[PDB]
Amino acid sequence: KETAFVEVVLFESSPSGDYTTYTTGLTGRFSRAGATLSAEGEIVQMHPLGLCNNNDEEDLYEYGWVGVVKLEQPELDPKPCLTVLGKAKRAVQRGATAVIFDVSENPEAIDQLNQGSEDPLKRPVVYVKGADAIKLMNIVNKQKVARARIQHQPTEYFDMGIFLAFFVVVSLVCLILLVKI
Amino acid sequence: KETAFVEVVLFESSPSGDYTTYTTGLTGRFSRAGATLSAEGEIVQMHPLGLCNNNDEEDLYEYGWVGVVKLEQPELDPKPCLTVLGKAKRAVQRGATAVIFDVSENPEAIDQLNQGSEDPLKRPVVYVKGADAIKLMNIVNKQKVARARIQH
Amino acid sequence: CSCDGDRRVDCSGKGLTAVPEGLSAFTQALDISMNNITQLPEDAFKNFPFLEELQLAGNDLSFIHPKALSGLKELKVLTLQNNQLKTVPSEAIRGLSALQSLRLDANHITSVPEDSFEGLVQLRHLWLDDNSLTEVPVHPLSNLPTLQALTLALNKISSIPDFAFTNLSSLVVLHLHNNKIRSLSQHCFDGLDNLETLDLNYNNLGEFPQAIKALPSLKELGFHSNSISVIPDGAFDGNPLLRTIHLYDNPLSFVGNSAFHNLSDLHSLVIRGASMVQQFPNLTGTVHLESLTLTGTKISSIPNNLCQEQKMLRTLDLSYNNIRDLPSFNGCHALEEISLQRNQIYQIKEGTFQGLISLRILDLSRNLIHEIHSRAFATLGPITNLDVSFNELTSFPTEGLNGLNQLKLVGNFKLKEALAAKDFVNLRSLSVPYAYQCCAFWGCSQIIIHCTPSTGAFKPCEYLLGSWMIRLTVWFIFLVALFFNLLVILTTFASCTSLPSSKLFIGLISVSNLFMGIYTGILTFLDAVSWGRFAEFGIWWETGSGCKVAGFLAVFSSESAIFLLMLATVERSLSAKDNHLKQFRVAALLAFLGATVAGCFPLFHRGEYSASPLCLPFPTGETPSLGFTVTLVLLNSLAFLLMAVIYTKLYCNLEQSSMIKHVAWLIFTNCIFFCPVAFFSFAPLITAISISPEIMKSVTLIFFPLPACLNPVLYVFFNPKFKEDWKLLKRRVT
Amino acid sequence: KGCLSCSKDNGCSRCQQKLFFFLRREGMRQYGECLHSCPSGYYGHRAPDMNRCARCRIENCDSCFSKDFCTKCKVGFYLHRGRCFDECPGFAPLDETMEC
Amino acid sequence: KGCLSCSKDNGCSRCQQKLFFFLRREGMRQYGECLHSCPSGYYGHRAPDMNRCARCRIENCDSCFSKDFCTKCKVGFYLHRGRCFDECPGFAPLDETMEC
Amino acid sequence: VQLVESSLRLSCAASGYTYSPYCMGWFRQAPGKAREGVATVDLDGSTIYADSVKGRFTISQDNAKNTLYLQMNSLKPEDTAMYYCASRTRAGVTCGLNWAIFSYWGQGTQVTVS
């Protein structure tokens, strides 16, 4: 349940070789249905109905795209082609390097993904809700090309063991009582 | 100086999606020139002479290209156009997200990068030497496309 | 050879030593480049009447028969670049009326025949750059009125005479860059109308040539790498259509206030080294600049009408000037990058950066800016980077900075105010002056923030002591030390009758360690009052006199204890050898004075105690005052070694017992508790070993004041003298 | 708009059963729409859950009734029965209708 | 080759005394080579230290004399002086030789 | 206009030349090397000799028979080469040892020290 930090990167692509970079931030959460590691790539949207195995053949993309999917209303499709984790694994099949689900309108998808811990996914899958998802959707709508990015000590023994250097003096107290009583 | 895990992923895809990817990991020593954070992108080789600000414009590359620069023996180039840190920053300006230097032939580049701590770089700079460097160069020479992923 | 379907025969690299035969007569492009041909026999190309492009680029050609190239009236391009022709083949290329391009650039040509280039009425591209000729072939070039491109780059032409290119009325591009040109006559560039590119880069020019006034159609001029120093006003009068000037790396002194006047199509101006320039150039009539760069000058003002024109301006570099005031940048909607570093800027007005959208990078480093307006960034667009390093700032605005990505304030030591992370939401790379200011950003919330001065463990964010373990350890160590040392002092000084030297040393050592107990108590009380909020008090504690007081207390106590132990060992040695109370008291006073001076030394120094809130100089600081740390460590080692060898000799030559046992216990415990402190002081400077700062701080805290809480207990419960003196005190009070 | 939900960002999802569903992509964003007929380079595969306008897969085909049968081929090829051919084996390649 | 260093994978870095250095790129790799003359679409800048072969920047140009001079323009334009023109101003545009 | 060629005295004859022999000369060629001038004779009788040639060799032109004789003496083993005689009818250029001005060349004979 690590607080995934999602930063979008927008490049101007100035003439000559200079590029120029701007960064915007938001916060989502890793889901136990997938792994938890930092990853970045070309952000691509995916309509939920587009993530279905029932289609005989679909367009392909270059490998390494971060999929942004906004789950529909829970009652909109009573008979989905696949579950939420099914759509996630289908997207990972279709060349994704991660998935960024939006569950603002579909709260139960968080429960589905968390319960799906028995079926872990090798590439990280983040879920985002609220104003963070709203602004991510605003960015993906208003912009053309971007780059999504997702990021996420036995010293206590050496602190507790310091009690030894002061509890040795208990032996001194015992030696004091030796000449007493 | 944390040993960054650099994983190359060579992909062949399929006619109906379902990308077929095969992985090969290695370990590369971080550098003080740049920050310490993850990076991922398509690998692109760069000639040591290919990073010189003398030319106003060479060509445009897509963003996020993980650069690979194989250094040569220093005495072969008595008057380099730019230092190693200068080449790294030029490559970052080109649109890169991480630069990997094969210092198998110029070990002094390690000292240069470590001393270059006076100016931190926004994106990580890694250097690889030895058997892992040989593996990286072999993969670059053989394969035609391969993702490179850097993890802490 | 490798015959091709498109009638383009390529014999490159075949190694043949003659003209290949058995080829179709309808070929139109013959390549004989890389092979070895040393001479062209007569009628060599008699089998190629329809040849159109001949490329001998690479042979070791050294002779061409006069009739070798005869009959090739359809030839259009000829390339003879990398051969070893010693001269222009004047007689060989006669009659090639259809020739349009000639490559002779890489030959070792040393002399051009007078009657060369005769009948070449269609020539348009000539290469002669990397030859070795000393004079421009004025007469041979006078017979080429249709030329459109000329290169004499790598030659050795000393100078150009008058009317050199008189008949080149249709020339377009001239390249003389790497030539060894030292002067240019006034009428050398005469008649070169519709010339659109001139290169004189690496010539050895002394002054600025005046021939340019005869180039009305010039577009690009390159004279950057010459030894030019003076560019007088009016140097570009005759070039109304000029678009690009290359004047970098030439050491200039004076460039004139009107050098670039009414240049409509100029799009760049980068001037370096103009030291004697102290006035902003007259840019009237030049309103198409993209990047303006005036780095090294003595400029002290900027015309307020700068942004009224030059609406296309993008980059503004005015760094190494001495700029005091700043006008209003209203306008310049396309202005992108602003550099105002290394000037002398006093204050930022409110409306200086009002509006000015799309401004991304703004450098204000190395400027004595003591005042920044509260709302000088509220109306600023997307600004990525912002550096105010080394600016002597007393306050910092907050509004409008949420969009910032990188903010740097490295040199603003006087900036003691606490920044708020509520504003810099998108901030990624922050460089605060003091490491305590970056506490609210969780150095290494919503995103990851990288702070340049590492917070670490030596700058406790919340707890100076650390965990409850260390907290209670230090708490009870201080309590024991203070209470027992006070009781021992009271018992010792209640009598004031018997003054043996050993008891004098015991009392003085107790007094010395009482100060260490006091400083440990100061630390404990500071931690208690600042529980979880210590980063707020960190700057106050470091910059205030409390840090100096604590550092003094600690250093003075330690050095006093060491000196007293050394003198006690000396007294024991004297007693073993065989009246001296006066000299021993004098030595004790001298040791006290020396300890006071050692403790006060950082006060004379600057910033030694500011290493950490511990304020103990050498343990937490190794690079600052490294010589002082080494000297103090060596002095302590010498004192300990001397006392140890004296004790060893005493036990060797000898078979009051309580005094001997107390001295032995004191020296052993002091050495044991003092070695790790020095080892951890020298630990950070040792590159090979790496120790965690939390461990270093805990070790320092648990080792430095240990003798203070140890020695009084030993003196109390390891000597019947305590019982005897307690009975004496009971008799005194009863 | 011939749909039921028509979300602002994701687009119109639940199209009417009488309208084909199409996925339009430009740049990062991609949304759903309802179209009476397939656009060029696609074939209308009606399904009980929703009428899809699937991508064409027959080579050199401009408009195809199905993924295999091509209705209107390109200018450089002619339809023998339902497939593009640069030179049909039988009938005149052109037939004045760019068909064979 | 005709170069001096010619490392296995980094390509020939230092070239001959009178040759041009050109950085070929294939797939992910980029290696140098030494050429007597620049290839199509490139112009050679000769310098005492290392002669380089740079890329043309004039639009619609197939082979250039220098940075701002095109020796042979593309098929769809005519070269007036050194620049491509779709319709030159003055002179006959085509002359059956693609020159104006 | 063909020019025929044959201690030695090389004899060259202008068999087809019309008139005005302008800037005749003699050249030697090493195997696989360029042709270097050894003696140049102008129409005024002025002579230009190579640095490694002057004193050892002599030249003499006779327009009555239109024959150019190059006398050679004290032949060092460095004189072994193929010798040609070259001529230039049309004038308008400065004389010298350059090989790029002569418009007619002979067949040349091989000479070695003997």
Would you mind describing this structure in some detail?
The complex is a heterohexamer, with two copies of chain A, one copy of chain C (734 residues), two copies of chain D (100 residues) and one copy of chain F (114 residues). Chain A is α/β, with parallel strands linked by helices and 181 residues long. Chain A is elongated. Chain A has helices spanning 84-93, 108-115, 131-142, 155-160, 163-167, 169-179, and strands at 3-11, 21-30, 39-45, 65-70, 96-102, 125-128, 147-151. Chain A is built from six helices and seven strands, in the order ββββαβαβαβααα. The longest helix of chain A is centred in the C-terminal third of the chain and has 12 residues, at 131-142. In chain C, helix 2 packs antiparallel against helix 3 (501-529). The longest helix of chain C has 33 residues, at 545-577. Helix content of chain D is 0%, strand content 31%. In chain D, strand 5 (61-63) and strand 6 form a beta hairpin. The radius of gyration of chain D is 17 Å and the shape is elongated. The N and C termini of chain D lie far apart (41 Å). Chain F is mostly beta strands. Chain F is built from no helices and ten strands. In chain F, the strands form two sheets. In chain F, strands 3, 4, 5, 8, 9 and 10 form a six-stranded antiparallel beta sheet that branches. In chain F, strands 1-2-7-6 form a four-stranded antiparallel beta sheet, with no helix packed on it. The radius of gyration of chain F is 13 Å and the shape is globular. Chain F starts with a strand and ends with a strand. The chains are: A alpha/beta (181), C alpha/beta (734), D mainly beta (100), F mainly beta (114). Chains in contact: A-B, A-C, A-D, B-C, B-E, C-E, C-F. The interface between A and B is medium-sized, with 25 and 31 residues.
Range of strand content of chain C: 5-15%
- Strand order across the largest sheet of chain C: 1-2-3-4-5-6-7-9-11-12-13
State the helical fraction of chain C. 25-40%
Strand residue content of chain A: 25-35%
Oligomer: heterohexamer
* DSSP summary: helix tally of chain C: 12
Largest interface, counted by CB within 8 Å of the partner chain's CB:
A-B, 25 and 31 residues
- Specify the overall morphology of chain C: elongated
Query: In this structure, how is the largest beta sheet of chain A organized?
Result: 7 strands, mixed, barrel
Rounded to an integer in angstroms, the radius of gyration calculated over CA atoms of chain C is 43 Å
Structural class of chain C: alpha/beta
Question: Got a strand count of chain A?
Answer: 7
PDB class: membrane protein
Keywords: LGR4-RSPO2-ZNRF3(delta RING), membrane protein
Assembly: hexameric
Entry title: the pentamerA complex of LGR4-RSPO2-ZNRF3(delta RING)
